[PDB]
Coordinates of C-alpha atoms and ligand atoms in Angstrom, one line a residue:
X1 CA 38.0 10.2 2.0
X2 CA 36.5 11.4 -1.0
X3 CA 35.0 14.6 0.2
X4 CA 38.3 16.0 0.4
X5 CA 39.0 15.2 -2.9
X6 CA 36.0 17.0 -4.8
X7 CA 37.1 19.8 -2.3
X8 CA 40.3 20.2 -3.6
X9 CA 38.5 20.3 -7.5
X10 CA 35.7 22.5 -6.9
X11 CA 38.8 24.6 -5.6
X12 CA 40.8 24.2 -8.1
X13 CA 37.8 24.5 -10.6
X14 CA 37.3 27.8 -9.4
X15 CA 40.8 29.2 -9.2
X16 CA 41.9 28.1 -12.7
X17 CA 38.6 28.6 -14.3
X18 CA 38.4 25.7 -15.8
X19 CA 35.2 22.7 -16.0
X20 CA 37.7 20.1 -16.3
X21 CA 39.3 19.1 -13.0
X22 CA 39.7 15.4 -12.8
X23 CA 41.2 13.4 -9.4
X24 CA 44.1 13.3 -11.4
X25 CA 44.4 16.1 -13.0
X26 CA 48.3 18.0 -12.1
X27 CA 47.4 21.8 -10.8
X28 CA 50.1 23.4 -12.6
X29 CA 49.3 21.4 -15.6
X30 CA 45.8 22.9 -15.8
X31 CA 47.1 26.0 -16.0
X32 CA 48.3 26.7 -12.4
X33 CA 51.1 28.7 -11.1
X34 CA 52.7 30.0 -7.7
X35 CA 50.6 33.2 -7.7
X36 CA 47.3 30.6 -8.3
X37 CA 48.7 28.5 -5.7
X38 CA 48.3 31.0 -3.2
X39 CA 44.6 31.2 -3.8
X40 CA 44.4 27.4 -3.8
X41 CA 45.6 27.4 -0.6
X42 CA 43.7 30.2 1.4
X43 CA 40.8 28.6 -0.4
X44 CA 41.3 25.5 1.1
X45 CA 42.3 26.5 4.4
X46 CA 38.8 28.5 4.5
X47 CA 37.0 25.6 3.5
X48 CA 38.4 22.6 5.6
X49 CA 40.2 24.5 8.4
X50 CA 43.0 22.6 8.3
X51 CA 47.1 24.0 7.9
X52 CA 47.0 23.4 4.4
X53 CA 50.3 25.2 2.9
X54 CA 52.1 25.5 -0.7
X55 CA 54.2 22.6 0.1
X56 CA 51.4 20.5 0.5
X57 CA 50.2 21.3 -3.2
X58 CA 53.7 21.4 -4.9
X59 CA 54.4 17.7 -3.6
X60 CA 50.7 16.8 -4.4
X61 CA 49.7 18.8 -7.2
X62 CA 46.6 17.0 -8.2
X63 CA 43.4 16.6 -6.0
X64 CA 43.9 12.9 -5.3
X65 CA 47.5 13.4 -4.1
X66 CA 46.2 16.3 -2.3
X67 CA 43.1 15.0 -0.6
X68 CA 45.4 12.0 -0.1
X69 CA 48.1 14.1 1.4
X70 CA 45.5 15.8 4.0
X71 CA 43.9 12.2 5.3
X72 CA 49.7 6.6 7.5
X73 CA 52.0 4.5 6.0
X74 CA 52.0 3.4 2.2
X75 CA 50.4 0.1 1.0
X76 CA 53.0 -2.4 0.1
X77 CA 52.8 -5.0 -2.0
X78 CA 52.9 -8.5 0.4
X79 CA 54.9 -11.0 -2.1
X80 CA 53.5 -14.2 -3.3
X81 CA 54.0 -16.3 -0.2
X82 CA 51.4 -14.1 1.9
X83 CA 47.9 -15.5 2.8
X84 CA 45.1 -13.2 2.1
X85 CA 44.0 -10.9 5.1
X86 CA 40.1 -9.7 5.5
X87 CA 40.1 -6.2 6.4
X88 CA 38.2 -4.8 9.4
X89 CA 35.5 -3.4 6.9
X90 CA 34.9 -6.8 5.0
X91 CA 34.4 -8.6 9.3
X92 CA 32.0 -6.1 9.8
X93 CA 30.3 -7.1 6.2
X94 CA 30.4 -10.8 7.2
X95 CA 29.2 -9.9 10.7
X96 CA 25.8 -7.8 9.7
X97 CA 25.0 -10.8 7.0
X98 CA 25.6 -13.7 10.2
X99 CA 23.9 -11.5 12.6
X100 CA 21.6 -9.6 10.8
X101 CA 20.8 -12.3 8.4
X102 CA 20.7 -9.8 5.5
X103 CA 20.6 -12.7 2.5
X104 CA 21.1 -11.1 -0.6
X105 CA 20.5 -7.5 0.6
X106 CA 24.4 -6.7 0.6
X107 CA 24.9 -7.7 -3.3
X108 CA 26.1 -5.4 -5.1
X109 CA 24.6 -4.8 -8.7
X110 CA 26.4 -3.8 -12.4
X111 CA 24.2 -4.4 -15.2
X112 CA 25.2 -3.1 -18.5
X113 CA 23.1 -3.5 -21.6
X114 CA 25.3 -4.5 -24.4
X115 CA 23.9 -4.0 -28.2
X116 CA 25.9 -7.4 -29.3
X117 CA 25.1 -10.8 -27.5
X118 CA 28.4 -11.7 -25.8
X119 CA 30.0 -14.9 -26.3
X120 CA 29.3 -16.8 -23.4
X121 CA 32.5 -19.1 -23.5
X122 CA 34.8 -15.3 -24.3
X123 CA 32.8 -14.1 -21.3
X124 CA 33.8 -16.9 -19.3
X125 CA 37.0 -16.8 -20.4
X126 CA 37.5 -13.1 -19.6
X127 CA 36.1 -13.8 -16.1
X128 CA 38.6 -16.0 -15.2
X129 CA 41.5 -13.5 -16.1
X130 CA 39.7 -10.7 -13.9
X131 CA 38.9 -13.6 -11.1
X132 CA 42.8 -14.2 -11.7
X133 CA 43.8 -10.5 -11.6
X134 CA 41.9 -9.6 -8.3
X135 CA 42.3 -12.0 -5.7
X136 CA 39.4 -10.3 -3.6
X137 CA 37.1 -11.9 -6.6
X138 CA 38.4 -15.8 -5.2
X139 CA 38.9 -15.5 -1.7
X140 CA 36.5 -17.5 0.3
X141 CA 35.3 -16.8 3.6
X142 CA 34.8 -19.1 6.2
X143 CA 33.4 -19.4 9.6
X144 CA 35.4 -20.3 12.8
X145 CA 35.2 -20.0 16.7
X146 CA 37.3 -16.6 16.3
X147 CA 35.5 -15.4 13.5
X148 CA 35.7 -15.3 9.8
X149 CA 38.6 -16.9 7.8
X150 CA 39.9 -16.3 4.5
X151 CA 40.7 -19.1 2.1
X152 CA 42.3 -17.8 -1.7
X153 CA 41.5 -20.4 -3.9
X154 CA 44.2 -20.6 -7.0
X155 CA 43.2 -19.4 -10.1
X156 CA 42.9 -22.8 -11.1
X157 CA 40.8 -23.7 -8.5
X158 CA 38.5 -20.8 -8.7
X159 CA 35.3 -22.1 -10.5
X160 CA 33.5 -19.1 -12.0
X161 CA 30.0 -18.4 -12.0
X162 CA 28.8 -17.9 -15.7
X163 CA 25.9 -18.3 -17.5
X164 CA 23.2 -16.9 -19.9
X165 CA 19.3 -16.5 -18.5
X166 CA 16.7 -16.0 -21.2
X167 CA 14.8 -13.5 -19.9
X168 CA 10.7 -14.1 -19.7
X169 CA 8.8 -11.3 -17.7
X170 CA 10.4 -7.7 -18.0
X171 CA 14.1 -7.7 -18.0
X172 CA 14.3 -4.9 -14.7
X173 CA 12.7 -7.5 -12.1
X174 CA 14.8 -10.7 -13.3
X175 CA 17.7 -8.3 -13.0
X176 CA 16.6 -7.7 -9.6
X177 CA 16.0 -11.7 -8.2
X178 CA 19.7 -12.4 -9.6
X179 CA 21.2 -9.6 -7.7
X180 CA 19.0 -10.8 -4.4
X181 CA 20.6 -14.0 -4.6
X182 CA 22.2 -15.6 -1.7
X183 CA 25.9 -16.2 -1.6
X184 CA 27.7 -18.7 0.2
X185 CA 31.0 -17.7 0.8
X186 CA 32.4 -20.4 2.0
X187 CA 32.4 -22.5 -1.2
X188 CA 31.4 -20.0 -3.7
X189 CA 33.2 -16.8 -5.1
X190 CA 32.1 -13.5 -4.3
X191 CA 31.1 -13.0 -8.2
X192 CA 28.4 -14.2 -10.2
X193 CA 28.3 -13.2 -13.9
X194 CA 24.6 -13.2 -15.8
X195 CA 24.1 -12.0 -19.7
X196 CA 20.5 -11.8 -20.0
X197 CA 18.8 -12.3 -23.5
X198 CA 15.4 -12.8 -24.4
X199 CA 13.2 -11.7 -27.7
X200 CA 12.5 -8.6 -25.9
X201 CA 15.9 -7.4 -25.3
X202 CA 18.3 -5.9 -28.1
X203 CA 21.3 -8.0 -27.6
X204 CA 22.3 -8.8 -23.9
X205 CA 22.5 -7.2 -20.5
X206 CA 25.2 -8.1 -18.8
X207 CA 25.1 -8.2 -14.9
X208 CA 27.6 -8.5 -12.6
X209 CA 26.4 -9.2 -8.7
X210 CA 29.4 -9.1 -6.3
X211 CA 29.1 -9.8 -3.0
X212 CA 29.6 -6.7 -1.0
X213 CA 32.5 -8.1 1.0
X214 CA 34.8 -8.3 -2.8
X215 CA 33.7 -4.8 -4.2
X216 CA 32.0 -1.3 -3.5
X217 CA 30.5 0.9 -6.1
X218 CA 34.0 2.6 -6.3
X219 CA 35.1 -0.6 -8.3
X220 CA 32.1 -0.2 -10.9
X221 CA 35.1 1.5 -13.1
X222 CA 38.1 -1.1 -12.9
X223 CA 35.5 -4.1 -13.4
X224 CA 34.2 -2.6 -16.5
X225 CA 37.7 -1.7 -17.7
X226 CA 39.5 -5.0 -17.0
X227 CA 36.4 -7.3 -18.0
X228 CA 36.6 -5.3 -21.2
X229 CA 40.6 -5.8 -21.7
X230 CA 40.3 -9.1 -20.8
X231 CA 37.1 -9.8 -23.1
X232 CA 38.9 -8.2 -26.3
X233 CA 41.8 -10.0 -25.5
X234 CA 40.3 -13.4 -25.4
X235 CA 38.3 -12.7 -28.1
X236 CA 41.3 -12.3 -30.2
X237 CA 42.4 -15.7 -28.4
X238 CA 45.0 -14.6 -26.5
X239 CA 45.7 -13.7 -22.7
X240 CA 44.9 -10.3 -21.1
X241 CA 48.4 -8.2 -21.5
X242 CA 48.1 -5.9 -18.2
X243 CA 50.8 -5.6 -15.3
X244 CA 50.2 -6.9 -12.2
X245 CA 47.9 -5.2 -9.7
X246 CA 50.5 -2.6 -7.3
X247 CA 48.5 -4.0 -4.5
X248 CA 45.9 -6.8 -3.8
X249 CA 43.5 -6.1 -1.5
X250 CA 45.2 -8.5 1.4
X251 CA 47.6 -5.9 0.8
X252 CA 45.2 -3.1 2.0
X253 CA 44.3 -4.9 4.7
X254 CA 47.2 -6.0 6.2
X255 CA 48.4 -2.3 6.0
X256 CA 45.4 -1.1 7.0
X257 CA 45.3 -3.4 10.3
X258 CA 49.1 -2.6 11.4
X259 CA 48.5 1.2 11.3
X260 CA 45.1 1.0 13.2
X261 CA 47.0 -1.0 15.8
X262 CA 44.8 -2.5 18.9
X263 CA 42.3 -0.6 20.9
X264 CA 43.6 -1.3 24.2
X265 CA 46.8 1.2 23.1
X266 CA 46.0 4.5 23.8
X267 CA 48.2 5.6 21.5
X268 CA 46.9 3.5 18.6
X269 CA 44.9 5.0 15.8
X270 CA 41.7 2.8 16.3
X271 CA 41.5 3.7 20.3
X272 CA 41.9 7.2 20.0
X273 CA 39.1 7.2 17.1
X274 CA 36.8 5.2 19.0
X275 CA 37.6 7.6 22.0
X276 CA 36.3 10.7 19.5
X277 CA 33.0 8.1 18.7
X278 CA 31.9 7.3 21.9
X279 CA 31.9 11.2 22.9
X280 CA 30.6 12.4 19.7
X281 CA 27.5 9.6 19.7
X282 CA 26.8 10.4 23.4
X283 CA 22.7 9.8 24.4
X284 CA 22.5 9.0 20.6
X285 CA 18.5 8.3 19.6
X286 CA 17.9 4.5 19.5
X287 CA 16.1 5.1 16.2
X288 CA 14.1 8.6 15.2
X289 CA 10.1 9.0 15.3
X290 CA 9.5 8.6 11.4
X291 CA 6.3 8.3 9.9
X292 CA 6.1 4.4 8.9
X293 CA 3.0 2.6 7.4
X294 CA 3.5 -0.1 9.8
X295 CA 5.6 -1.4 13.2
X296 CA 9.1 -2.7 12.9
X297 CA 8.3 -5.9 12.9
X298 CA 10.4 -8.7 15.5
X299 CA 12.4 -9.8 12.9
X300 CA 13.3 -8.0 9.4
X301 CA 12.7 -9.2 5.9
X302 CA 15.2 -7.1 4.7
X303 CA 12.6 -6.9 1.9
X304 CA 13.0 -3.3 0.2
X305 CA 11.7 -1.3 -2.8
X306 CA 13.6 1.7 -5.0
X307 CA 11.6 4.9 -5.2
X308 CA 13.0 7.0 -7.8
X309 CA 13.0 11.1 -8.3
X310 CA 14.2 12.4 -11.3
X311 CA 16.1 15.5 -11.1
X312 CA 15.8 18.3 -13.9
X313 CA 19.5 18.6 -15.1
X314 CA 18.8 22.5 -14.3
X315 CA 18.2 21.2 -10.7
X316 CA 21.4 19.3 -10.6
X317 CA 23.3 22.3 -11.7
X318 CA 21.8 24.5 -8.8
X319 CA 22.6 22.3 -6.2
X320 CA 25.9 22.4 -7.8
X321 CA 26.1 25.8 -7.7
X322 CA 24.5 25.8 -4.1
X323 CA 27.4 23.5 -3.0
X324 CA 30.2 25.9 -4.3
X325 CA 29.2 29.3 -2.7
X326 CA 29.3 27.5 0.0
X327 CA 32.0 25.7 0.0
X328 CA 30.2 22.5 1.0
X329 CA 30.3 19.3 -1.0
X330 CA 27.1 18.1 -3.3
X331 CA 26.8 15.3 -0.7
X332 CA 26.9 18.1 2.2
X333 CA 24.2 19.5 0.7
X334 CA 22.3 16.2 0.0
X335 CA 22.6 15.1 3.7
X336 CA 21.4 18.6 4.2
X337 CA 18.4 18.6 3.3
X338 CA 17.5 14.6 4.4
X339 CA 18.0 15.9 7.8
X340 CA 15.6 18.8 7.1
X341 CA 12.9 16.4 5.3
X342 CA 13.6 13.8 8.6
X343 CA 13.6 16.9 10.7
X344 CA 10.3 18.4 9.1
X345 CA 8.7 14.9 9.4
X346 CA 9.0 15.5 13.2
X347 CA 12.2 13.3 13.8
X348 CA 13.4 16.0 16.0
X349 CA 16.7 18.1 16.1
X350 CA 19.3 15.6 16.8
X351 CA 19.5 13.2 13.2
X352 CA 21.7 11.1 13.1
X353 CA 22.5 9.6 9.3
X354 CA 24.9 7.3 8.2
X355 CA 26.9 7.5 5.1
X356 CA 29.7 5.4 3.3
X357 CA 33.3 7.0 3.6
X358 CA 35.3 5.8 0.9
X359 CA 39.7 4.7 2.3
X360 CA 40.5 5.1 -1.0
X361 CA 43.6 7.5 -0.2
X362 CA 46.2 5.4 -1.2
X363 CA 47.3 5.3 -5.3
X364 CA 47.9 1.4 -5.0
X365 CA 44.0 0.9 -4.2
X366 CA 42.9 4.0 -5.5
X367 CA 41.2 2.5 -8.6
X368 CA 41.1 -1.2 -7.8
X369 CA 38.0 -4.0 -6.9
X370 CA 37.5 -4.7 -3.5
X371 CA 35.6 -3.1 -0.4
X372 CA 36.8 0.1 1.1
X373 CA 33.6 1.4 2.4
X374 CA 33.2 2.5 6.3
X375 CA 30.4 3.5 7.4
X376 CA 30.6 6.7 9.8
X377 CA 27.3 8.0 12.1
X378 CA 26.7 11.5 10.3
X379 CA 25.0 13.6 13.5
X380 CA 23.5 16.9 12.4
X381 CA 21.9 19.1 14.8
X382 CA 19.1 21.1 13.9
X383 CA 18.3 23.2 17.1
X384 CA 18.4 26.8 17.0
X385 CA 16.0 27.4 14.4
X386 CA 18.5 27.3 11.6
X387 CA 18.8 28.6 7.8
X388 CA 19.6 26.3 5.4
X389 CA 22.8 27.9 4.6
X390 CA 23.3 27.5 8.7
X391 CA 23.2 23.9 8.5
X392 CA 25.7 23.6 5.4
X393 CA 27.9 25.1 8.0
X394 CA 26.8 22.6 10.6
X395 CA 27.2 19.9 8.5
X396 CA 30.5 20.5 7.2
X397 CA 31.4 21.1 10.3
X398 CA 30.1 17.6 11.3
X399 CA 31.8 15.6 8.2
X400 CA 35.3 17.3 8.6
X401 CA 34.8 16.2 12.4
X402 CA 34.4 12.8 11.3
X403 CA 36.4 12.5 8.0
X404 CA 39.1 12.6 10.7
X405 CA 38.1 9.5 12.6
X406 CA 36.7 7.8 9.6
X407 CA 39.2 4.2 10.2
X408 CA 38.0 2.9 13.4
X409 CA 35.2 0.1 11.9
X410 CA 31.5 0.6 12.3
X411 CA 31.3 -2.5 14.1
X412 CA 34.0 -1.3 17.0
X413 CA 32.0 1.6 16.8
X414 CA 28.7 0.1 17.8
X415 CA 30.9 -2.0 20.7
X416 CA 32.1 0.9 22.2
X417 CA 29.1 3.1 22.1
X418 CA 26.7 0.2 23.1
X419 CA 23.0 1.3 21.8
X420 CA 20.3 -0.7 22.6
X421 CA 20.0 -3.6 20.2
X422 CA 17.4 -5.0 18.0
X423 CA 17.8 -7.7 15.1
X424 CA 14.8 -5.5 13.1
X425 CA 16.4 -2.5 13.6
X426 CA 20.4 -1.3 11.9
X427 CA 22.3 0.6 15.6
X428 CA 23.2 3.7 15.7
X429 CA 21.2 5.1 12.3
X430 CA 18.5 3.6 10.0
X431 CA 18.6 6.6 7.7
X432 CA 21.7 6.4 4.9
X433 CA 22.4 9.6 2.8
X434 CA 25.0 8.9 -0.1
X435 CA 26.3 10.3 -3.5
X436 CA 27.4 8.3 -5.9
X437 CA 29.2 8.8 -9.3
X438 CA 28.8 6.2 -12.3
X439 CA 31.6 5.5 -14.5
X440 CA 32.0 7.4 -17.7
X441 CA 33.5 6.7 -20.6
X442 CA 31.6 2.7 -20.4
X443 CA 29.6 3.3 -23.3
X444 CA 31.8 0.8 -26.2
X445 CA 32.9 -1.7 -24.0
X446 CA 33.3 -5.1 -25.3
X447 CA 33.4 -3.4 -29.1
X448 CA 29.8 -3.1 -29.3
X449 CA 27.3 0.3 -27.7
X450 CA 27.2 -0.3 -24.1
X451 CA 25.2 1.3 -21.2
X452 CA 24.8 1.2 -17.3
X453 CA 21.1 0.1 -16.4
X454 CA 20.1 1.0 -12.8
X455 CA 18.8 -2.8 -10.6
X456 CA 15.6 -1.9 -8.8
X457 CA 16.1 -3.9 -5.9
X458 CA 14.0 -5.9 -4.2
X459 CA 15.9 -5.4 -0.6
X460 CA 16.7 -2.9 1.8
X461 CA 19.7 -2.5 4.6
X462 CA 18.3 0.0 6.6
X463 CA 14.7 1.7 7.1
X464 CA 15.9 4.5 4.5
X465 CA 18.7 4.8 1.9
X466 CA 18.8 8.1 0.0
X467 CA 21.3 7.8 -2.9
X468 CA 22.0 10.8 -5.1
X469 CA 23.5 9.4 -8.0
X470 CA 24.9 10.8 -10.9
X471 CA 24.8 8.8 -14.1
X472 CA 28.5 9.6 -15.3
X473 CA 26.9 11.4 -18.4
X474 CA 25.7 14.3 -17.0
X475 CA 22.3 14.0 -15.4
X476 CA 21.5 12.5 -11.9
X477 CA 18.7 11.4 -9.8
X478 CA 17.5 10.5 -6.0
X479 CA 17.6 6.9 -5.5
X480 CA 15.3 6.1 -2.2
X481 CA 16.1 2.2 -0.9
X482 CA 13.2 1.7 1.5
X483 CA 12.4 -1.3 3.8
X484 CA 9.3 -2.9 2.8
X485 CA 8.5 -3.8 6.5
X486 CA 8.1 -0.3 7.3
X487 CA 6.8 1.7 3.9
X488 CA 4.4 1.2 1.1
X489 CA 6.3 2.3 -2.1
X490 CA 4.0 5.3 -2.8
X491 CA 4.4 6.5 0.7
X492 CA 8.4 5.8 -0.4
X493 CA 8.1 7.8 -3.5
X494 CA 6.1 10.8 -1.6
X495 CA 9.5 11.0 0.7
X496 CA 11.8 11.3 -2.2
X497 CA 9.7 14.0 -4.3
X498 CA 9.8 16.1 -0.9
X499 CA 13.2 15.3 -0.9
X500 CA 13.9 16.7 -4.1
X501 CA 11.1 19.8 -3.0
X502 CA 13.5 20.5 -0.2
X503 CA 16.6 20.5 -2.4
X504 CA 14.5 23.3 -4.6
X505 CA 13.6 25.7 -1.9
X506 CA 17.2 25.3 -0.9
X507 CA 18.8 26.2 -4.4
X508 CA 16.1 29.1 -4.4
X509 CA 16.6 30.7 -1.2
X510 CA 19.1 28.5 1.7
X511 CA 18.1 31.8 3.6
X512 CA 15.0 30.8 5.1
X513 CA 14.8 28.6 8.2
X514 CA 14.8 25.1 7.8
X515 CA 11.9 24.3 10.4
Ligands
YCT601 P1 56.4 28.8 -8.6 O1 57.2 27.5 -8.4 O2 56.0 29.0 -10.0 O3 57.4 30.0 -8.1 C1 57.7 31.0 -9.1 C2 59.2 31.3 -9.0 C3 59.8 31.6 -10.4 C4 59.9 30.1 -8.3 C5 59.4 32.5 -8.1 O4 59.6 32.1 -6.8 C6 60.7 33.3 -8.5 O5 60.6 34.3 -9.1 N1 62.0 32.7 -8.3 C7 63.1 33.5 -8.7 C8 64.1 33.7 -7.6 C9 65.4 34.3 -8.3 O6 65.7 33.8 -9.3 N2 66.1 35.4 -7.8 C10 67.2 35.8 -8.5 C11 68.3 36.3 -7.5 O7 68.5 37.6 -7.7 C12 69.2 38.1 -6.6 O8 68.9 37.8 -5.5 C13 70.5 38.8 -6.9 N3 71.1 39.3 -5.6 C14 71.5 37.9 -7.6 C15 72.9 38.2 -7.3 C16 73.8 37.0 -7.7 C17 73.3 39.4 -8.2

């Protein structure tokens, strides 16, 4: 879980009085000490009410080990002879898409603008070695009577997808249709790699569009920094020199599997979190009563817009703020306040949002491609005509809850609580609340000046996706996915300015009722 770990930095932020605190940065390196540690402790014990101790933070010292260390054993490296595993969370992926019928809505965008035109037979050179490196990146997934199957193709056998698009009509929308594109996993690789010139365009955009079920926006980093090692490298006509991966993500998987165990043990790990899910999303709402410009429709187009709100870097800063004195989490306070916009909007006191959880604990998988997203049901309550400081309270208290149960798979989660179902409508929540961090430090990749471009896309997962998404250079803004079906983009970009209006009174006074 990454909450946990921007807990332990905005704690140890505070203690050491320092702006720097990075994942993996060592406490007592930053300046720390056994009198400090004392502070870092009853800090953290305040904040997530767990028995955190000084043992805890001598033998994890930075806030990955420690956020690590509060979440089971190790990943372990599988040896060559091992056939790839899919992992719970990519079935569920490869369920929604057959089930759902999603298309392309599940692809996940990287565009970078690059100030050179890249060498299309380098790039497709360099592809291959990160298609080689990351096995998650070839393996195939096929359908059978028990489900999906994986099939790793060789790296010799691994046909990559690359190729240069001259770009007519603005550059934004054609970056868009690529990343809607279909895949077919069961002959083509989870990757497709675009560079997109054009005599409007200064050099090239480079796109990457992975299939959800081979990365999550946690791998944005790694693909930038290995397609760039492995770019250089063949540009100097020679091979990539980088270790093997500590773990591939069959690896993950298979470890992940054996520790969840099977759900008729009532001992196992995936049983006794269900057990906590089917309490906690007792006489859940089959959907909340938002305002929509039209009906759900019988069947979804998974059709979907982006409605953008910029956020005043003085903004971004207060929520900050906002988040520390109360010991909650920018996301915290994020979800926060979509519940009170949903809540003011007449959806009633018992919201229930979904949000990505990152199971990015272990070292061996902390920084590498692949998918390690669950998706956990987020219920705040609003009743009691609460402050907005209140609900931070509520809602940490809500997240810590389910932080703890954050391994048993969405889809096992939707078996055992059984809503009502509806191919037009996403169970158990249609409202997503997420924060996202861009990679820094991608701005002279490929020896040229290089920046991240945001993919307005043209589809939508749910009926609402609120992203609050911080660039990696400092500023950040509120990303609103919305499903075309349901809202007119103006109606879309009405919800997130009052989103942003409600983060404002918040920062100003989280005193004052939320109704
Ligand atoms: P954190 O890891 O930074 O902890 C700080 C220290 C330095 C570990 C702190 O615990 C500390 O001061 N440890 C020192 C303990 C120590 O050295 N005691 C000396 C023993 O003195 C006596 O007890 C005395 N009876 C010695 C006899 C042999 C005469």
């Amino acid at each position: 879980v990454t909450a946990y770990e921007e807990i332990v930095c905005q704690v140890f932020a505070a203690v050491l009085d320092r702006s720097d605190v990075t994942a993996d940065a060592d406490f007592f390196a930053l300046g720390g000490h056994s009198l400090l540690s004392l502070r870092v402790v009853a800090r953290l014990r305040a904040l997530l009410g767990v028995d955190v101790g000084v043992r805890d933070l001598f033998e994890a010292p930075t806030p990955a080990a420690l956020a690590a260390r509060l979440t089971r054993p190790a990943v372990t490296r599988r040896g060559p002879d091992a056939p790839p595993v899919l992992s719970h969370f990519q079935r569920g992926l490869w369920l929604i898409e057959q089930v759902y019928q999603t298309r392309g809505a599940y692809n996940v965008p990287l565009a970078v603008h690059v100030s050179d035109r890249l060498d299309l037979d380098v790039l497709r050179a360099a592809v291959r070695d990160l298609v080689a490196r990351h096995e998650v990146l070839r393996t195939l997934v096929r359908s059978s009577d028990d489900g999906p199957d994986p099939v790793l193709l060789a790296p010799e056998d691994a046909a990559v997808d690359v190729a240069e698009v001259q770009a007519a009509g603005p550059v934004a929308d054609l970056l868009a249709e690529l990343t809607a594109q279909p895949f077919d996993l069961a002959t083509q690789i989870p990757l497709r790699v675009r560079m997109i010139t054009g005599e409007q365009v200064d050099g090239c955009v480079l796109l990457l569009v992975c299939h959800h079920i081979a990365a999550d926006e946690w791998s944005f980093a790694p693909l930038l920094r290995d397609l760039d090692t492995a770019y250089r490298a063949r540009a100097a006509g020679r091979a990539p020199d980088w270790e093997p991966l500590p773990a591939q993500y069959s690896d993950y998987a298979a470890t992940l599997h054996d520790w969840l165990g099977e759900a008729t043990d009532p001992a196992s790990p995936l049983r006794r979190q269900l057990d906590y899910w089917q309490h906690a999303l007792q006489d859940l709402p089959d959907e909340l009563d938002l305002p929509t410009d039209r009906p759900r429709p019988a069947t979804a187009s998974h059709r979907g817009g982006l409605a953008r709100a910029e956020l005043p870097p003085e903004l971004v800063e207060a929520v900050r703020r906002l988040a520390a004195q109360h010991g909650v989490t920018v996301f915290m306070v994020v979800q926060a306040a979509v519940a009170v916009l949903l809540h003011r909007l007449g959806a009633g006191d018992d919201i229930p949002l979904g949000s990505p959880v990152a199971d990015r604990a272990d070292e061996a998988v902390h920084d590498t491609v692949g998918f390690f997203l669950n998706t956990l049901v987020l219920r705040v309550n609003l009743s009691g005509n609460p402050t907005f400081a209140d609900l931070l309270d509520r809602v940490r208290a809500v997240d810590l809850e389910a932080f703890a149960r954050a391994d048993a798979p969405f889809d096992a989660v939707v078996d055992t609580v059984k809503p009502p179902r509806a191919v037009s409508r996403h169970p158990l929540f249609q409202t997503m609340v997420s924060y996202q961090r861009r990679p820094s430090d991608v701005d002279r990749l490929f020896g040229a000046a290089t920046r991240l471009v945001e993919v307005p896309l043209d589809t939508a997962k749910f009926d609402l996706e609120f992203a609050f998404i911080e660039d990696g250079h400092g500023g950040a803004h509120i990303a609103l996915n919305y499903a075309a079906d349901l809202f007119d983009h103006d109606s879309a970009e009405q919800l997130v300015a009052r989103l942003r209006t409600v983060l404002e009174h918040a920062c100003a006074d989280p005193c004052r009722p939320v109704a």
